[PDB]
Design a protein around this ligand. Structure first.
Ligand SMILES: Nc1ncnc2c1ncn2[C@@H]1O[C@H](COP(=O)(O)OP(=O)(O)OP(=O)(O)O)[C@@H](O)[C@H]1O
Ligand SMILES: Nc1ncnc2c1ncn2[C@@H]1O[C@H](COP(=O)(O)OP(=O)(O)OP(=O)(O)O)[C@@H](O)[C@H]1O
Ligand SMILES: O=C(O)CCCC[C@@H]1SC[C@@H]2NC(=O)N[C@@H]21
Ligand SMILES: O=C(O)CCCC[C@@H]1SC[C@@H]2NC(=O)N[C@@H]21
Lengths: 235, 235
């Protein structure tokens, strides 16, 4: 009865009033490509390293099942599809979101959404958490806070699914296109710090052809970062 | 994204742009109680005895998985939950739905909805087809046709799920209550013909404590009908 007109993403949608995690459910269940798993609230929502992702009622918490018949080298760009999709949807609602490489979307430097891509066999799970009308952690923001009024959650869902379907269908044919859309919507030319054993600071210049973040250290040395479990912050 | 606040029915919802039959999917798949299977259209929708059920886009085609812990003798009353639920939803939209015993809902004697219950052990599937904005076959009508304008399909879905959840919750506690609601919303006091192995005509007087249709033949003979595979016709 939703009447979705998308081609792949959204051919089927499984909704839960409550779930542990849409990403976990998508990883452990046999689901056809394009299936969207969405829930009003998650009790065990997570980001990387099992980090807790606050998922109270009011936000958009979903995962999408994908099985990209593209070269192995291209699979790492799926996270960008989610990020750009969110930016496009925010724009439709007159909100200017900017991508914090490589999985976050910020509005005036406050985090409004996060993306988490996981694998299980040859299935890829694209998870997206977007703050809409829900309470958010201090420092973060939501569509409601930016617009000053409650936003119709289903309208946001319809918009995002439509944008992701378009981005994904093009990705299957032209996998390099997503990189320029990311570059034009990403926070660059600013100083950042990458943590971990041997942490360092430098200017985030761009992303390369593999989606790696290019950082120029004060010494002039250029490092290429693969997100993985690294921590990035704007100083 | 839906924000359903029901207790059992609607805890989970699986939506399909297209499906063979929501009843078949529900019967076949491993699903939790309360799960609603809904599709924009069905390619192989059916009623009893594999009779074709036209399910074009615009209508509400859904099935609900139930595992009612009530006496075996009460299970035949589940069809009434579907019929009454539909009537209540129609009344909420100011449409005069009346029950044609025991599985159909009519508006001005034209079929607007049909209920089909299929069971097997600890699993009952309550199927409901309601014409909303879709084109319908002759002898039928739709909400749009009766109101003279299109009706928001999602609004009808929310209304029906809420009514069904309430009716089901009460059914688990008092399986007899549904019979009073059927009596107050069913077409009675008119001549009908029962078509099965042979046939007979008489006045549809009421339904008894088992939900059987009580018919008074002209001779004065009283027959108690169990729907099963018989058909009821108005004269
Ligand atoms: N609803 C939310 N809105 C915004 N940020 C959230 C929300 N829930 C949790 N967070 C924050 O987001 C992080 C989520 O996990 P994850 O590591 O995947 O995000 P990240 O941005 O890539 O990493 P980082 O912790 O360095 O910001 C948590 O550590 C938490 O600080
Ligand atoms: N969209 C629709 N709206 C109304 N009626 C329909 C629709 N699609 C099919 N039908 C009719 O409904 C019937 C459905 O099957 P079923 O036997 O279960 O219903 P019934 O009302 O109990 O039987 P009967 O048609 O003999 O009175 C079909 O035989 C067909 O005539
Ligand atoms: O902060 C990030 O960048 C990652 C957060 C990803 C959150 C979404 S909410 C839908 C899905 N289910 C989860 O448990 N995580 C992801
Ligand atoms: O006419 C009747 O009384 C029965 C029709 C039941 C139709 C619904 S549509 C949703 C579900 N899926 C099916 O194939 N049949 C039922």
């Amino acid at each position: 009865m939703l009447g979705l007109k998308t081609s792949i993403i959204g051919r089927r949608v499984i909704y839960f009033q409550e779930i542990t995690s849409t990403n976990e459910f998508a990883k452990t269940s046999y689901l056809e490509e394009g299936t969207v798993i969405v829930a009003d609230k998650q009790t065990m929502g997570h980001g990387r390293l099992n980090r807790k992702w606050e998922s109270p009622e009011g936000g958009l918490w979903l995962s999408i099942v994908l099985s990209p018949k593209v070269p192995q080298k291209d699979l790492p760009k799926i996270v960008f599809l989610g990020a750009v999709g969110v930016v496009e949807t925010l724009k439709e609602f007159s909100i200017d979101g900017r991508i914090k490489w490589p999985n976050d979307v910020l509005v005036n430097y406050k985090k409004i959404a996060g993306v988490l891509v996981e694998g299980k066999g040859d299935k890829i799970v694209l998870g997206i958490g977007l703050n809409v009308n829900n309470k958010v952690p201090n420092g973060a923001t939501s569509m409601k806070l930016e617009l000053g009024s409650e936003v119709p959650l289903l309208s946001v869902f319809r918009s995002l699914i439509t944008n992701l379907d378009r981005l994904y269908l093009n990705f299957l044919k032209n996998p390099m296109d997503i990189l320029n859309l990311v570059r034009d919507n990403m926070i660059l030319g600013v100083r950042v710090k990458i943590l971990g054993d041997g942490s360092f600071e430098g200017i985030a210049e761009d992303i390369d052809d593999f989606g790696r973040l290019i950082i120029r250290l004060d010494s002039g040395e250029v490092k290429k970062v693969i997100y993985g479990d690294v921590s990035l912050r704007f100083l």
